[PDB]
């Protein structure tokens, strides 16, 4: 029922700190003090906090101010025992970034965007952060003829290669996590899905330092299966971090509490992350909530919502465990042949010639007869939902 | 008018679709393959493609199979049509209800491979250069039913074998994985162009693998087709392309190319044809994977075949005119489209030189730059006016 | 729990009888005998069975054949005690209906469509059906210029008025329910959402005999809130029947078991239907499942899936009940001011003159103070989900 | 071509005046002076201007200021010859409306919301406006249990009835147009489509005074066919006004220039509005553009975008007329039987009795022969498109 530091729950300062100024209205909440955020999160059970440079230090603060703020923040982490597992840079808010940071058509903007990141990398290293998340929110376009995608990908790579060079030379040991999003705020953003982000990373100079930071709602904005995408990310060993939240399909980015959107997929996701090979989780990084307390809430509503994320995750974990431990489930899994997918299609040392000589794989194969046996998938699915519902 | 240099190809199953849908009986009778070859030759197609089962009915004995192939070859011969690509039906028969290569049942997986090997031999025999693989039954309706990790291992296992075989026999085939987000399965493995490219990078001979993206498949997720093709070209993995029309996220419509998202059909033709030199950015077949609407008879079928070609040639013409317009050149200059091609760093500059440049940060006036407009709407308006023949 | 006839669970013969021939493949199951379907349904607790004319009597059966089928059917009904609460007509399968039934551009098709329905109304009336469901699956277009919508709505209305007339005159006492669907099989279908159907119904000669038959996946295909659209249908008093199933947002029509798609919306739907005003349900017609056993299943999976629909409804019902009887939930509802929406805005006898005179409604209204109070919506949503999860 | 006042192109002050502060970044343009707006629009060809109360007069302006602004505003109109065809009220920006205006759970907010509109009605009547647009952007919910939809529709109706009462008694002669939108800013907005809005309006006390104001993007946000919904709206006679813009399916509300989103559907929409019966337009109200100049643009891009809206409409208009006048199209329309849909299904004086007596409509009908003939829809669509491309 209660969270432990071993759970690795983290929250972005920009989450609980969201003032609720949306596209159609003014802020409904006052600004949250970074120091206070540190104490309340520590208090609800979080193990770490994350932030955008501009979330902690107001864009344009002098070094005197900047330094003061960092010192205070640092104290709070100290007193509470919270760590900073990841940091990110704001390359989307200021008007200069209206056509992107790393991929702006304007060369000067591109030089400036890199500088802004190098700086944040420095603070990150000083606070002990291990991951740099890159969300290229303005990289993309509203009109096709406005952006040369090829040139854009060259420029994205150019910037990223420099960042790895630097981290490596300074010995920061950072890992870089590219965050995919299909749209909002640009009409279409470059690297729209977890798949596009993985393919791209494979083309960098030191690909081993790069992975992705997929977000629940981002994949759901395209009506994709989040769990299946994570599974693919895991297969590639590129799941460097993860943003959990809720969404209701293809519409604006809702950023609801984790599990308040597609509940069934929230369940299969916890099951995937926690019931890894041999008991152990399949994923070891932070369970980071990138969500927003609804505009209708006050600070009470804010802390409630922060705890709801933790709660949802632990209730789901609990049922995922019980689902897998149930002998009846175990029996249905067997009947559906789920584990049979783990056995190689080919026998040991078997190649094309041995397979071509096997009459049982074609010539004497009774396709009609195998075609008629059911897989028992509805029943396995029903057992999963009953565990989810606390009915089994 | 189409020329063989335009490289328009059609699948046997497009004009031959009987229009039996999820809710109704077929409204057209079967199309004869020899007949299809002659009719397509006539409308300007340079090539024809087919799934094994479109040409040779599932379960035909060798004599029968052999007869059909011989007739087909003769038709090819007489018309001068080629077979640029072949594919395998791993989705129709009940045995494939949970997948071909990734079925939970090991025996189906083994059978799926034998079915493809056989089609590879025929493709090789017909001179095909590309093997398209559409894993339409690979995926699931429920998350607990499919171990995705094991599924990718098995998908990989099967493809490495296919490459081994092609390479040992000297077939020279290229393999193009075709992504689709859903339908017939709730969720299909390798759902977008991105997922398929990322996957291909993990096979044993990656240089032999690429993708076969379909306009409608990316649009079913509301993705920018042109933008995904641009990324595929950047990775150099555009091995083939399936063109058609779609109206956003709904069942797969397979309309004629350009009958769904017209603006994106226009930017797509511009991308493929107004390539690097002056030359096309893509040199493969312009394959139409579409379906003549169920409301049409055979006159409708041939009309729809021609409409695909017409749409492409009309778009190509306006794409060319768009690029040659001085007013467009001017707008491209104001929007700094070309400035994106200049490296961010000066030659020989690294992080140490960038950090020493006070003008890239310390003395950079972001406020001032942030106020200048890119003039992107205006550029967009000139493009649309070229499309409408308004200029 | 166990279903009782009071639960009024019904299934279409075409649900458990779907042979699983989809758009990309052959049938994976053999045909189900109607009599056998009656027996099996009765055995799992269904109270009724429904059917399309063509599901029971093969298209073009001679009168002797048709009569034979009907008689055997009636005996099964008799023997099992199942009823036929609704009947429907297939105006979509045969090639003649490729451009629609009532709205085909071809006049002779429109005339035939009406006669096919009149014939089904007769059989409906003889079996005791009270509702005739109309699903115009082929009414629409793939291209905008191919169909005059205004003319199409005129012809639709022309056919429906005749049907009401005939029924009225024969004393059949049928109620008509138009079933909306956005697309599939046509690119765009006329009367795409529950809203469009209701607005249409209001224009017929006798609106009182007309309502809608909304389906969970159909509204979800447009990514609309099914519960909220049902709430509006109930407000209008036009919910004549309902089709329950599962869907995963905008994609082909999945027709999964009820609750296997958007679980959270399924939960709020059961709450709305059963926890109606004054203790009792807000809706009393059949709880009809218009779903399809997945193509991967055999006849065992088919009955499993039929039972899963009922189980799903009963489990959510139980949790909806517990939700509302929870003093904490009640306390959250009061804090969120849900019930306060039920109090008129105007005081009894107050008009604009009086409203205009109330300085507390404007001149002395402190918008800023009210604007800062939180509604507690997240917390209320969390308690709801904790009930569904059986965590409370 | 060139716009004339007879084209009736109108624009909201908030359109060209949008400063470009989005959900993720700061404003990229300075504020637009209303008088300048009047002058600039007059210059590009607009015949009228519209606005929300708060667009013109800053929220919380003293009487003198308010009065001051209006007077200058009227001079500019005077000087330029522009009119104010429609007025609307902002019930979505201020924090007090976070849960809605008319249907806020909070009764005091509902009363305030009504007062705010009454005042705008007065200003509207004074400026000569004919239509009051009502966009309930905050009416809806993020969570199902937080909003009683039935009570919300009662409260919505209660507010609308009062407004009609007031206008009629003051002799303002306004018509009311409800604007549907599926989501954004609420997770789900009440009256999500043109359909639901029409159904609702039919339940008001003086339904003849209420219609709808559908927006292209709003219907496309749910992937619906805008042209077909407008055709239904015209069938019902409820198209009181229309908002024209562009959108790229189900995603955040883009508000692109008209015809910059779904070009094919913008084409068919212009054809429907202009190639009306008796040669004349089927719609005679304002052609209002509710769009936003992209965030990447400056004031020059702003006027460019304003003009693009007009050029798009006139270029499309020009091609719709050519299309209809083409003999080959006339031949295709005939083969597709588009016009045969206009001839009643029944012969004059025929009812069910005579239809039942017609063996040719059923007993002797050859469904198979009819089912084999094609409609030539593809050819007809190809011709429409070639006209759109200026290829014919
Ligand atoms: O859509 C917003 C993104 O999810 C953002 O919060 C990042 O993760 C950090 O820049
Ligand atoms: O959705 C169907 C696929 O597009 C298929 O036709 C492949 O391209 C070849 O099997
Ligand atoms: O999508 C098909 C429809 O839902 C159908 O089953 C109707 O409910 C009755 O013809
Ligand atoms: O999405 C915003 C609405 O379209 C708004 O502009 C209304 O039309 C006027 O309140
Ligand atoms: Mn997000
Ligand atoms: Mn994120
Ligand atoms: Mn397709
Ligand atoms: Mn294809
Ligand atoms: Mn359905
Ligand atoms: Mn149904
Ligand atoms: Mn809008
Ligand atoms: Mn609007």
């Amino acid at each position: 029922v209660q969270a432990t530091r071993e759970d690795k729950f983290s929250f972005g300062l920009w989450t609980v700190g969201w003032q609720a100024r949306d596209a159609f209205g003014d802020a409904t909440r006052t600004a949250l003090d970074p120091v206070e955020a540190v104490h309340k999160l520590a208090e609800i059970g979080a193990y770490g906090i994350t932030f955008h440079d501009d979330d902690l230090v107001p864009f344009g603060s002098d070094a005197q101010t900047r330094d003061g703020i960092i010192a205070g923040f640092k104290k709070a982490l100290d007193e509470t025992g919270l760590i900073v597992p990841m940091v990110t840079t704001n390359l989307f808010t200021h008007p200069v970034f209206k056509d992107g940071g790393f991929t702006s058509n304007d060369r000067s903007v591109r030089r400036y965007a890199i500088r802004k990141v190098l700086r944040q990398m420095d603070l990150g290293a000083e606070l002990g952060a291990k991951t740099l998340v890159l969300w290229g929110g303005r990289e993309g376009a509203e009109y096709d003829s406005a952006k040369d995608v090829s040139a854009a990908l060259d420029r994205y790579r150019e910037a990223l290669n420099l960042l790895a060079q630097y981290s490596e030379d300074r010995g920061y040991g950072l890992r870089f996590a590219i965050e995919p999003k299909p749209n909002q705020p640009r009409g279409d953003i470059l690297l729209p899905t977890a798949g596009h982000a993985i393919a791209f990373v494979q083309e960098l100079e030191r690909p081993e330092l790069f992975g992705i930071n997929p977000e629940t709602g981002h994949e759901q904005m395209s009506n994709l299966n989040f769990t299946q995408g994570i599974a693919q990310a895991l297969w590639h060993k590129k799941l460097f971090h993860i943003d959990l939240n809720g969404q209701h399909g293809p519409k604006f980015d809702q950023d609801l509490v984790f599990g308040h959107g597609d509940l069934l997929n929230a369940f299969s996701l916890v099951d995937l992350l926690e019931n890894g090979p041999d008991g152990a989780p399949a994923y070891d990084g932070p369970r980071h909530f990138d969500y927003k307390p609804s505009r209708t809430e006050d600070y009470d509503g804010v802390w409630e919502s922060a705890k709801a994320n933790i709660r949802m995750y632990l209730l789901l974990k609990e049922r995922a465990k019980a689902f897998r431990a149930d002998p009846e489930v175990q029996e249905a899994l067997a009947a559906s042949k789920v584990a049979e997918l783990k056995t190689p299609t080919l026998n040991p040392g078997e190649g094309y010639a041995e397979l071509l000589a096997d009459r049982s794989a074609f010539e004497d194969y009774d396709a009609d007869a195998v075609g008629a046996k059911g897989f028992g998938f509805v029943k396995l699915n029903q057992l999963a939902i009953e565990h989810l519902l606390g009915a089994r």
Side-chain angles (χ1 to χ4, degrees), chain A residues 1 3-5 7-63 65-277 279-392:
Chain A
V1 315
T4 70
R5 136 163 228 202
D7 284 331
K8 310 207 207 200
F9 294 129
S10 44
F11 293 76
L13 175 62
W14 66 92
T15 74
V16 297
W18 190 57
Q19 278 178 267
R21 150 177 249 171
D22 65 22
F24 298 88
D26 303 328
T28 68
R29 296 181 293 264
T30 53
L32 176 72
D33 170 69
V35 168
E36 205 195 318
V38 178
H39 289 97
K40 310 260 36 198
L41 287 171
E43 172 188 320
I44 82 196
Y47 102 121
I49 190 183
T50 74
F51 63 97
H52 291 92
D53 52 349
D54 306 337
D55 305 317
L56 188 57
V57 183
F59 185 79
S61 284
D62 45 58
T65 310
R66 171 152 185 298
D67 281 340
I69 293 172
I70 295 162
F73 184 71
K74 235 131 144 206
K75 253 208 211 174
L77 297 174
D78 231 278
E79 274 150 23
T80 69
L82 244 58
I83 74 166
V84 174
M86 171 279 276
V87 293
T88 188
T89 323
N90 185 322
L91 300 179
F92 54 86
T93 301
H94 191 282
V96 72
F97 298 127
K98 62 195 167 178
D99 187 45
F102 297 156
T103 79
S104 171
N105 280 356
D106 184 301
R107 187 173 194 250
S108 81
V109 178
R110 309 197 300 270
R111 290 175 71 81
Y112 178 66
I114 299 177
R115 288 294 304 280
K116 195 168 197 290
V117 180
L118 290 171
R119 199 201 201 183
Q120 178 72 344
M121 291 177 59
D122 291 330
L123 177 55
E126 184 177 315
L127 303 167
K130 313 171 100 205
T131 305
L132 176 78
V133 153
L134 299 127
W135 173 59
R138 298 282 174 190
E139 314 315 313
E142 285 65 62
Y143 312 106
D144 297 334
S145 64
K147 187 61 49 174
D148 173 323
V149 172
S150 199
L153 297 179
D154 275 349
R155 302 286 82 75
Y156 214 143
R157 168 166 63 188
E158 179 177 19
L160 293 186
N161 280 341
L162 185 153
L163 307 183
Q165 197 54 64
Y166 183 70
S167 166
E168 283 303 277
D169 285 359
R170 296 280 248 104
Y172 293 157
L174 290 169
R175 278 195 322 171
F176 307 82
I178 304 318
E179 186 159 349
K181 190 195 210 175
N183 62 250
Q184 193 175 62
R186 304 306 303 272
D188 289 296
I189 290 178
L190 301 175
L191 312 181
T193 76
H196 303 73
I198 297 163
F200 168 82
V201 138
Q202 292 165 330
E203 300 303 353
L204 300 179
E205 201 182 279
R206 302 146 204 274
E208 68 287 352
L209 302 180
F210 295 88
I212 63 156
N213 178 47
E215 188 162 298
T216 311
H218 295 184
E219 305 301 296
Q220 300 175 163
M221 279 165 79
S222 293
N223 203 37
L224 299 173
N225 183 320
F226 188 72
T227 299
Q228 297 191 344
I230 294 309
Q232 180 168 348
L234 281 178
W235 183 72
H236 283 112
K237 290 162 165 133
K238 291 305 194 184
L239 180 66
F240 286 15
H241 193 265
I242 195 171
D243 280 355
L244 301 173
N245 67 3
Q247 162 81 20
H248 295 284
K251 59 176 58 168
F252 64 102
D253 181 29
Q254 293 199 270
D255 282 340
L256 305 173
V257 163
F258 176 63
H260 291 193
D262 181 346
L263 179 62
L264 284 178
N265 202 251
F267 178 61
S268 65
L269 172 76
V270 172
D271 182 50
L272 178 72
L273 306 182
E274 300 303 330
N275 298 310
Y283 170 67
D284 267 297
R287 277 65 171 171
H288 184 253
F289 301 104
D290 174 6
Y291 91 107
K292 283 171 174 44
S294 291
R295 184 164 181 276
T296 59
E297 316 289 303
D298 68 10
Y299 272 107
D300 282 341
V302 168
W303 307 112
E304 210 66 42
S305 77
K307 313 193 219 212
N309 282 282
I310 291 168
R311 250 290 207 196
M312 287 301 301
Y313 193 107
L314 298 176
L315 290 174
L316 297 179
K317 195 181 167 166
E318 183 190 345
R319 287 149 178 76
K321 254 47 221 223
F323 168 60
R324 299 293 170 177
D326 183 358
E328 249 192 90
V329 158
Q330 275 162 22
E331 210 162 273
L333 286 171
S336 300
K337 296 168 178 284
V338 174
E340 184 167 315
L341 188 57
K342 300 173 102 153
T343 300
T345 298
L346 299 174
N347 296 304
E350 184 184 30
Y352 57 80
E354 295 67 23
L355 179 70
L356 285 166
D358 179 7
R359 288 180 55 94
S360 84
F362 193 80
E363 296 85 358
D364 295 339
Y365 187 63
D366 192 10
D368 295 324
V370 174
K373 303 164 183 225
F375 283 89
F377 297 148
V378 174
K379 179 194 194 211
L380 170 65
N381 191 54
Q382 183 61 25
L383 284 176
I385 303 181
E386 288 193 20
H387 276 275
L388 171 62
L389 294 192
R392 327 247 319 169

